Amino acid sequence: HHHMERVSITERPDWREKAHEYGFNFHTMYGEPYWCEDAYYKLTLAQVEKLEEVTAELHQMCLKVVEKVIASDELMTKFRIPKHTWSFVRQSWLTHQPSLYSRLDLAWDGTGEPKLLENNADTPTSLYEAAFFQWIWLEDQLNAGNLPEGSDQFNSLQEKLIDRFVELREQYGFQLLHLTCCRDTVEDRGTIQYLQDCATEAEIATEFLYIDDIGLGEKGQFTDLQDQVISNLFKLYPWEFMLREMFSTKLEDAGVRWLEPAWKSIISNKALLPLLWEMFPNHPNLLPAYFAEDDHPQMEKYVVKPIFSNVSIIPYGEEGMIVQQFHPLPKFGDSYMLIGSWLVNDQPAGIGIREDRALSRFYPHIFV
Ligand SMILES: Nc1ncnc2c1ncn2[C@@H]1O[C@H](COP(=O)(O)OP(=O)(O)O)[C@@H](O)[C@H]1O
Ligand code: NI
């Protein structure tokens, strides 16, 4: 029993070439899901307003977590933030460094309350499909008459991303934005090029360069492929790796503003889950979660997750682990379904639906 349905649909005949034409590599890579459109998910307006409401509040609840964590060496330690980066992460929060985006993982089928599994607040995947590709899919399958006549979609990602980039340029001085990722990863997924086009629309000058193209200047500044100073850098590379990398002590004095900013390392951290539960006990959209090392109430079945990264249900031990009450994803046919609910800064911007056979695939949605 669900209050959303998975509706089979006839695939568009030229969607693979539409992807190729837009520079979208729809294949699975580095956690990016494989696009599918032999089906779509059908929601109601009520469900979407609910998702929006919950998404905006959960985001505010996450900012409260950061505020508390940043102010106690104890919590910065329980969050495994490397001590030699504490000043870098703290100053990033105390100077109010701006955020571009986040994606909440929400378990929900329309029944009961949506539950926060995790907040992908650093390098969330499936951006292109959610913002752009599934919107073209909607426009197309409407014109082909394969969707109900009043079909809409919970998706303002592109509009909000461009408006956020205008905000960054006009009020935070982001005139030139560098964009970067690891060579031989997701540069041809389409994410970097799509965000670059959004920044360009917002009249931001952009430059792409690979992680290994970044140079270390004489006074510690980071420099691009024209040996010029990098002031603002979008990265598709997680803080969990960067804060442990060889020249991470250079971060504090590099003179670079980052998207996502360093303080997002605290939100995009599984330790978020116990802190949310302690600060907001029995919140309707939270699950019981505790640090594994702590004396905590016993749970019938739960999930163990690392504080820096494989999830399992009850081999990992206690140290560096959180536990969270098990809450099964809704099953549609042979697959479990998960909602990915996007934020642009603090503004809910819509959802993408993902499926997997195991407790891999992205499906479009509509709402009526
Ligand atoms: N509390 C939970 N109850 C049931 N399933 C869960 C729970 N937490 C995570 N899962 C399952 O594990 C998968 C990965 O968990 P997640 O916290 O999203 O890790 P990752 O950061 O690797 O995506 C989720 O897609 C979901 O299928
Ligand atoms: Ni082509």
Swiss-Prot record:
GO molecular function: ATP binding; ligase activity; metal ion binding
EC number(s) stated in the UniProt entry for this protein: 6.3.1.-
Keywords: ATP-binding, Ligase, Magnesium, Metal-binding, Nucleotide-binding
Signal peptide: none
Binding locations of Mg(2+) 2: E118, N120
Positions in coiled-coil regions: none
Binding positions for Mg(2+) 1 per the UniProt entry: D105, E118
Uppermost EC category: ligase
Site (Transition state stabilizer): R103
Binding, ATP: R103, L104, D105, K270, K305, Q324
Effect of disrupting the coding gene: Deletion of this gene does not affect the ability to synthesize glutathionylspermidine. There is no visible differences between wild-type and mutant strain growth in LB media.
Family: Belongs to the glutathionylspermidine synthase preATP-grasp family.
Entry function: May be a ligase forming an amide bond. Shows ATPase activity. Despite its similarity to the C-terminal synthetase domain of Gss, is not a glutathionylspermidine (Gsp) synthetase. Cannot synthesize Gsp, glutathione (GSH), or GSH intermediates, from GSH and spermidine, cysteine and glutamate, gamma-glutamylcysteine and spermidine, and gamma-glutamylcysteine and glycine. Does not bind to Gsp.
Protein name: Putative acid--amine ligase YgiC
